[PDB]
Design an enzyme around this catalytic site. Sequence first.
Site, short mmCIF file in Angstrom:
data_model
loop_
_atom_site.label_atom_id
_atom_site.label_comp_id
_atom_site.label_asym_id
_atom_site.label_seq_id
_atom_site.Cartn_x
_atom_site.Cartn_y
_atom_site.Cartn_z
N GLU A 247 18.28 0.54 4.20
CA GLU A 247 16.93 1.08 4.16
C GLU A 247 16.77 2.17 5.22
OE1 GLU A 247 13.82 2.15 3.16
OE2 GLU A 247 13.63 0.13 2.28
N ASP B 41 17.97 -3.83 1.61
CA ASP B 41 17.64 -3.28 2.91
C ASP B 41 18.80 -3.36 3.90
OD1 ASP B 41 14.90 -2.54 2.27
OD2 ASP B 41 14.46 -4.67 2.27
O1 LIG Z 1 13.15 -0.07 -0.86
C1 LIG Z 1 12.04 -0.64 -0.96
C2 LIG Z 1 11.01 0.00 -1.87
C3 LIG Z 1 9.74 -0.73 -1.92
C4 LIG Z 1 8.74 -0.20 -2.74
C5 LIG Z 1 7.50 -0.83 -2.85
C6 LIG Z 1 7.26 -2.01 -2.13
C7 LIG Z 1 8.26 -2.55 -1.31
C8 LIG Z 1 9.51 -1.91 -1.20
C9 LIG Z 1 10.57 -2.50 -0.31
O2 LIG Z 1 10.39 -3.55 0.34
N1 LIG Z 1 11.80 -1.83 -0.23
O3 LIG Z 1 12.68 -2.31 0.50
MN LIG Z 2 12.27 -4.43 1.46
MN LIG Z 3 14.65 -1.27 0.47
#
Ligand SMILES: O=C1Cc2ccccc2C(=O)N1O
Ligand SMILES: [Mn+2]
Ligand SMILES: [Mn+2]
Length: 180
Positions: A61, A89
């Site tokens: 991430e 992540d």
């Molecule tokens: O990559 C993402 C994209 C995302 C989009 C919308 C809500 C939560 C997330 C999220 O927790 N991650 O890790």
């Molecule tokens: Mn996430």
């Molecule tokens: Mn993510």
Amino acid sequence: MEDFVRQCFNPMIVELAEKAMKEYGEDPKIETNKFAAICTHLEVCFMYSDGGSKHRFEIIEGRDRTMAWTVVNSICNTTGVEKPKFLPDLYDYKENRFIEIGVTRREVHTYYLEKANKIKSEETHIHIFSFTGEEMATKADYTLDEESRARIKTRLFTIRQEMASRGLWDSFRQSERAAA
Ligand SMILES: O=C1Cc2ccccc2C(=O)N1O
Ligand SMILES: [Mn+2]
Ligand SMILES: [Mn+2]
């Protein structure tokens, strides 16, 4: 709220949050709740990666998407682990699984299930934090020690208090509901 975000999180996190929104056609200046949420989620991911022994975690991430996928492919091709449908992540080199980290203003279990049905993996570990001190992880395996999780929880509760003290909290809590 825009200014609160910029004085609450470090510039590195803020900068990464702006990029992330722009690539999705979101404007930080307008969708300021999403801006806060992304910053918060980033901050938790980095705290989480810092909670292990030095080499323990690959951070996924906060990277450019294309380099994020490249690193994911390298981990899979070298550990034999299943390739995820969605970008996780972190990768845990100790436990040999990807981790999805969630941070929610709603109940932890609600969010947990939404995240689980979306990714559809018997491999990817999921770990949710709330702004109220609750956590939920796959198979009640929280990965990190108590000390590290507690620091994260404290930080999240400080963010909530800081928001509340400025009257931004209701709107930030409601906004996750109006999205889902
Ligand atoms: O990559 C993402 C994209 C995302 C989009 C919308 C809500 C939560 C997330 C999220 O927790 N991650 O890790
Ligand atoms: Mn996430
Ligand atoms: Mn993510």
